[PDB]
């Protein structure tokens, strides 16, 4: 689908509210496999199961290994911009 920019707002006491799967070692993008109810990704409205995460706050995630992506994603705070695509 089209590449989208999506804003997520979160406070420091919570996570993103997603499960991710995939990554470079598996030959696939970082993919959202779950959106957890009532958590920031669900609340933001624009992120969905099946979306590939291309970048977060300008940090490219397309060639990143799974754990690399976890570290990068979990470091982000506050108002967080995602670049995502559903395919």
């Amino acid at each position: 689908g089209p590449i989208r920019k999506v804003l997520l707002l979160k406070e420091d006491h919570e996570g993103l509210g997603i499960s991710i799967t995939g990554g470079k070692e598996h030959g696939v993008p970082i993919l959202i496999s779950e959106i957890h109810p009532g958590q920031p990704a669900d609340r933001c409205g624009g992120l969905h199961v099946g979306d590939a995460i291309l970048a977060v706050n300008g940090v490219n995630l397309r060639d990143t290994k799974h754990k690399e992506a976890v570290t990068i994603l979990s470091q982000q705070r506050g108002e967080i911009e995602f670049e995502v695509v559903y395919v």
Partner: peptide, 10 residues
């Protein structure tokens, strides 16, 4: 499901 691919809750 298969679960060959790693999954993380974040």
């Amino acid at each position: 499901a298969n679960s060959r691919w790693k999954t993380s809750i974040i």
